[PDB]
Amino acid sequence: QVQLVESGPEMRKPGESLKISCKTSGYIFSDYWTAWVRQLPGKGLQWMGIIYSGDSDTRYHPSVQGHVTMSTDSSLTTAYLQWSSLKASDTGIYYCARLDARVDAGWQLDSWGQGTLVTVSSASTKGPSVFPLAPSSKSTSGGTAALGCLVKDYFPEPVTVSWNSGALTSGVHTFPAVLQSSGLYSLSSVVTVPSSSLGTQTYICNVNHKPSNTKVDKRVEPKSCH
Amino acid sequence: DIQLTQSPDSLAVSLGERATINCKSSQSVFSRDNNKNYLAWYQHKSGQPPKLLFFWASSRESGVSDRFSGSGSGTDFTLTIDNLQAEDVALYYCQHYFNTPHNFGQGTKLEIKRTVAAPSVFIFPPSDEQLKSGTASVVCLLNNFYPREAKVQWKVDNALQSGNSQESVTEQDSKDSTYSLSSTLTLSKADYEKHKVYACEVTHQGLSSPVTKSFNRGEC
């Protein structure tokens, strides 16, 4: 069906070039524009502009003109956003979204990409260390056990956490990362489960940090005494 | 260049009640040629891409709940959510597409009010793996509480700590409208092994006294 799929997260140094992509499928590319939208810190969306693949006709927001460039590959039904010389303040989430080009149509954005976190920093990329938060009598009460993973010392954002390859979602809390004094991020992901089934169920946190090409699966087992 | 300004910036509304979010356009976005307002509303939930709700100010996108409605024209617009549900917790944006640029409003944060719920508290000593690396993180979890205002204090051998912890709170849950909070006390392995009792002490309006969760280092 109708889909817009963006590149994974990207990490670059200031001054470097970058082109992110938005692969569209499920609809006729030539019947639509493609818009790029930037998410602002805290709250807010900035309409950056649009591009029609038919003749590469472009509108830009007057305050993004000339710093970013939109293009398309109609053959690949894909739209691009490009910086020739990144600045650290370009960091943030960028969405693509489709817009009806037809006569008749309003120019609302009815389908959206998942967003791409672009980070621009002179600091070094670093993959996380992943440590178990083991269920024990100190995290078990009322029939409920809490367990989780500590994801420590990574850069940049984002780190992705799933549990049991996505089969475990209810009761999961993956906390917003904190910025340590070291300039590295840390977060935790926790889940509450029945304490009765700790002996029969298996809990694995799957940790992904694409900027460092790091993937960690950590089995989280109940604490025992040795 | 036409700008949109939303009111309020933030709104906290009880489950079952009505939520009203307003959008004021700096110029009219009503066309006498087409008899249409060039306006849309979007929902943006945590961790999801933005979703189209209305266009032409009042025309409802397919699959959007009948509890939602868009009204207004010219320069004043309203998004109304009746019978507020837990899953409505989100940021809401208006956008015009009258001319270029197709600007969005600054966003309105819709928060849900629910009954008071005290946190369940859990504590995690550091893993043996991490201890091998030379550092010790102690984690305290405050699960599923409301309202958001909760306090955590660390005590090590009954001495109040300062300067060695960080905390983070979740966004509001889309199912039970609660929050959770994680706090981490971090020490060197050396400092960690100089003490025995590690305690997390929790205050919340849902509790009449502070709740303490603790463990003794080394006790299996």
Residue numbers in the entry:
A (entry chain H): 1 to 52, 52A, 53 to 82, 82A, 82B, 82C, 83 to 100, 100A, ...
B (entry chain L): 1 to 27, 27A, 27B, 27C, 27D, 27E, 27F, 28 to 214
Text from the published report:
Tau is a microtubule-associated protein expressed predominantly in neuronal axons and promotes the assembly and stability of microtubules. Hyperphosphorylation of tau is thought to lead to microtubule dissociation and assembly of the normally disordered, highly soluble protein into β sheet-rich aggregated fibrils called paired helical filaments (PHFs) that make up NFTs. Two unique tau binding antibodies, CBTAU-27.1 and CBTAU-28.1, which are both derived from the VH5–51 and VL4–1 germline families, were identified. CBTAU-28.1 Asp65 makes a salt bridge with Arg59 (HCDR2) and a hydrogen bond with Tyr102 (LCDR3). These two antibodies thus recognize a Pro – Xn – Lys motif in different tau peptides, where n is from 4 up to at least 7 amino acids.
By binding to the region that is critical for the aggregation of tau and which forms the core of PHFs, CBTAU-27.1 prevents aggregation of tau in vitro. Furthermore, the epitope of CBTAU-27.1 is specific for tau, and is not present on MAP2, a microtubule stabilizing protein closely related to tau.
